Protein backbone atom coordinates (compact mmCIF):
# COMPACT_ATOMS: atom_id res chain seq x y z
CA UNK A 1 0.00 0.00 0.00
CA UNK A 2 3.06 2.22 -0.51
CA UNK A 3 4.12 3.88 -3.77
CA UNK A 4 7.51 5.35 -4.64
CA UNK A 5 8.17 8.09 -7.21
CA UNK A 6 11.68 8.54 -8.61
CA UNK A 7 12.86 11.26 -11.00
CA UNK A 8 16.35 11.97 -12.33
CA UNK A 9 18.14 13.74 -15.15
CA UNK A 10 20.41 10.72 -15.73
CA UNK A 11 18.85 7.25 -15.77
CA UNK A 12 22.13 5.50 -14.91
CA UNK A 13 21.83 6.78 -11.35
CA UNK A 14 18.07 6.26 -11.51
CA UNK A 15 18.08 2.63 -12.65
CA UNK A 16 20.85 1.65 -10.23
CA UNK A 17 19.17 3.43 -7.31
CA UNK A 18 15.79 1.97 -8.26
CA UNK A 19 17.22 -1.56 -8.12
CA UNK A 20 18.53 -0.93 -4.61
CA UNK A 21 14.99 -0.27 -3.39
CA UNK A 22 13.60 -3.41 -5.06
CA UNK A 23 16.08 -5.74 -3.37
CA UNK A 24 15.70 -4.10 0.05
CA UNK A 25 11.90 -3.87 -0.13
CA UNK A 26 11.40 -7.55 -0.97
CA UNK A 27 13.46 -8.49 2.09
CA UNK A 28 10.60 -7.41 4.37
CA UNK A 29 7.79 -6.34 2.03
CA UNK A 30 8.03 -9.22 -0.43
CA UNK A 31 4.94 -7.96 -2.31
CA UNK A 32 6.79 -5.58 -4.64
CA UNK A 33 5.87 -4.97 -8.27
CA UNK A 34 8.53 -4.23 -10.85
CA UNK A 35 9.53 -0.67 -11.69
CA UNK A 36 7.28 1.07 -14.21
CA UNK A 37 9.04 3.29 -16.78
CA UNK A 38 6.80 6.36 -16.80
CA UNK A 39 7.15 8.59 -19.88
CA UNK A 40 10.05 11.02 -20.00
CA UNK A 41 9.36 14.75 -20.22
CA UNK A 42 11.55 16.87 -22.50
CA UNK A 43 12.02 20.60 -23.07
CA UNK A 44 13.99 22.50 -25.71
CA UNK A 45 15.66 25.93 -25.51
CA UNK A 46 16.71 27.43 -28.84
CA UNK A 47 19.16 30.32 -28.42
CA UNK A 48 20.75 32.77 -30.83
CA UNK A 49 24.32 31.62 -31.37
CA UNK A 50 25.94 35.02 -31.95
CA UNK A 51 25.80 38.13 -29.76
CA UNK A 52 24.83 41.07 -31.99
CA UNK A 53 23.59 40.00 -35.45
CA UNK A 54 22.77 36.76 -37.25
CA UNK A 55 19.34 35.63 -36.07
CA UNK A 56 19.50 32.85 -38.68
CA UNK A 57 22.25 31.01 -36.77
CA UNK A 58 20.95 29.48 -33.54
CA UNK A 59 21.64 26.68 -31.08
CA UNK A 60 19.34 24.25 -29.28
CA UNK A 61 19.61 22.64 -25.85
CA UNK A 62 17.47 20.00 -24.17
CA UNK A 63 16.56 18.70 -20.72
CA UNK A 64 15.23 15.13 -20.55
CA UNK A 65 13.87 13.89 -17.21
CA UNK A 66 13.30 10.20 -16.50
CA UNK A 67 10.74 8.84 -14.04
CA UNK A 68 10.10 5.49 -12.38
CA UNK A 69 7.46 3.92 -10.14
CA UNK A 70 7.72 1.37 -7.33
CA UNK A 71 4.63 -0.24 -5.80
CA UNK A 72 4.29 -2.35 -2.65
CA UNK A 73 1.15 -4.33 -1.81
CA UNK A 74 1.65 -5.79 1.67
CA UNK A 75 4.10 -3.71 3.74
CA UNK A 76 6.15 -4.79 6.75
CA UNK A 77 7.02 -2.95 9.97
CA UNK A 78 10.66 -2.62 8.87
CA UNK A 79 9.78 -1.87 5.23
CA UNK A 80 9.31 1.84 5.96
CA UNK A 81 12.49 1.78 8.05
CA UNK A 82 14.26 -0.09 5.24
CA UNK A 83 13.01 2.49 2.74
CA UNK A 84 14.04 5.28 5.12
CA UNK A 85 17.53 3.84 5.64
CA UNK A 86 18.26 3.45 1.91
CA UNK A 87 19.38 7.00 1.09
CA UNK A 88 19.91 7.43 -2.64
CA UNK A 89 22.68 9.77 -3.85
CA UNK A 90 22.09 13.15 -5.46
CA UNK A 91 20.79 13.48 -8.99
CA UNK A 92 17.69 11.44 -8.06
CA UNK A 93 14.64 12.65 -6.14
CA UNK A 94 12.56 10.21 -4.12
CA UNK A 95 8.96 10.68 -2.99
CA UNK A 96 6.90 8.28 -0.90
Amino acid sequence: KIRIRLKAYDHRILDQSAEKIVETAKRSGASVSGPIPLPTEKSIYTVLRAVHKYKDSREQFEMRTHKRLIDIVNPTPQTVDSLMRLDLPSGVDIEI
Binding site: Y9, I44, V47, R49, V51, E59, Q60, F61, E62, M63
Partner: protein
Amino acid sequence: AKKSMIAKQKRTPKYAVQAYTRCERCGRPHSVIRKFKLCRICFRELAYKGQIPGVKKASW
Protein backbone atom coordinates in the same frame (compact mmCIF):
# COMPACT_ATOMS: atom_id res chain seq x y z
CA ALA B 1 25.09 53.53 -16.64
CA LYS B 2 24.60 49.99 -15.34
CA LYS B 3 25.61 49.80 -11.66
CA SER B 4 22.83 52.27 -10.85
CA MET B 5 20.39 50.32 -13.04
CA ILE B 6 21.06 46.98 -11.34
CA ALA B 7 20.67 48.54 -7.89
CA LYS B 8 17.41 50.18 -8.97
CA GLN B 9 15.93 46.85 -10.09
CA LYS B 10 16.74 45.22 -6.74
CA ARG B 11 14.65 47.52 -4.54
CA THR B 12 10.87 47.33 -4.63
CA PRO B 13 9.20 49.74 -7.09
CA LYS B 14 6.20 52.04 -6.71
CA TYR B 15 3.77 49.51 -8.20
CA ALA B 16 4.04 45.84 -9.12
CA VAL B 17 4.05 46.71 -12.84
CA GLN B 18 7.35 48.61 -12.73
CA ALA B 19 9.13 45.41 -11.66
CA TYR B 20 10.88 43.30 -14.29
CA THR B 21 13.65 40.73 -14.76
CA ARG B 22 17.38 41.22 -15.21
CA CYS B 23 20.24 38.79 -15.84
CA GLU B 24 22.03 37.92 -12.61
CA ARG B 25 25.59 37.52 -13.89
CA CYS B 26 25.93 40.24 -16.51
CA GLY B 27 22.75 42.29 -16.19
CA ARG B 28 21.33 42.72 -19.68
CA PRO B 29 17.56 43.29 -19.80
CA HIS B 30 16.70 41.57 -23.08
CA SER B 31 16.17 37.84 -23.59
CA VAL B 32 16.19 36.45 -20.05
CA ILE B 33 14.83 32.98 -19.24
CA ARG B 34 13.23 32.76 -15.81
CA LYS B 35 13.83 29.02 -15.53
CA PHE B 36 17.52 29.82 -14.95
CA LYS B 37 17.43 33.64 -14.58
CA LEU B 38 20.25 33.94 -17.11
CA CYS B 39 20.32 35.74 -20.42
CA ARG B 40 20.82 33.88 -23.68
CA ILE B 41 24.57 34.58 -23.65
CA CYS B 42 25.41 33.59 -20.08
CA PHE B 43 23.22 30.51 -20.55
CA ARG B 44 25.26 29.28 -23.52
CA GLU B 45 28.69 30.14 -22.11
CA LEU B 46 27.95 28.38 -18.82
CA ALA B 47 26.03 25.35 -20.12
CA TYR B 48 29.13 24.31 -22.08
CA LYS B 49 31.02 24.29 -18.77
CA GLY B 50 28.79 21.52 -17.41
CA GLN B 51 27.38 23.53 -14.51
CA ILE B 52 23.65 23.52 -15.37
CA PRO B 53 22.24 20.12 -14.32
CA GLY B 54 20.17 18.35 -16.95
CA VAL B 55 21.12 20.80 -19.69
CA LYS B 56 22.91 19.23 -22.65
CA LYS B 57 23.31 20.11 -26.31
CA ALA B 58 20.31 18.93 -28.32
CA SER B 59 20.71 16.99 -31.55
CA TRP B 60 17.17 15.71 -31.27
